[PDB]
Symmetry: C2
Subunit: 115 residues, 2 copies
Amino acid sequence: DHIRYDILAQDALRGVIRKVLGEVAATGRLPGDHHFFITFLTGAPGVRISQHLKSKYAEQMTIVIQHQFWDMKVTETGFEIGLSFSDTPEKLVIPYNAIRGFYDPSVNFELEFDV
Amino acid sequence: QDHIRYDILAQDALRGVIRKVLGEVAATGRLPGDHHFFITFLTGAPGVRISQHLKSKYAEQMTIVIQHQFWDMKVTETGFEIGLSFSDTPEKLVIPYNAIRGFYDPSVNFELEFDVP
């Protein structure tokens, strides 16, 4: 039991999500008809949100990076993005370890983690 | 139309798990707990270095077991090297990571598969 394959795998997969949106942010544009549905834990450590959003999605929120999003920056720890809302601009930092689900419908790809 | 190819990205990532695990063992020199690996690879793939004895005994695929009697395990950038005994004649094997087709750890029922061809 000395080997935590489950952890190792999820860090590895986690790092795929890093590479991906890592190159989407490089060019600012999203390739072909691609787009992501990243589901994360609003209260996870490392997460940077607003009491506004947190008082809206107490446990977990699901953003959607499509057509045009903004300010997306991608670090080894997580991704920062802009999220224009009906009444206020929001900017959240979502650390990878906080992501519990990544879904890309264009190529029917799905990742799920234990949070 | 896929511009990202998640599969190739997931595969190299998981292949990366085999690297740190095999690399951790190569460090110490002993498998932890009841862990042991069933590594299946292509004897034909390039970079693979095995003897005529084994290449003839095994056509294209082969499954090796790292458990009780292994020596000189060296993890490199390209793949890894391991020493095992087959029918009492010691052997040295060079397996490049991209030649691995499957990795199984019966100890904790953990298996990984790749498109080795």
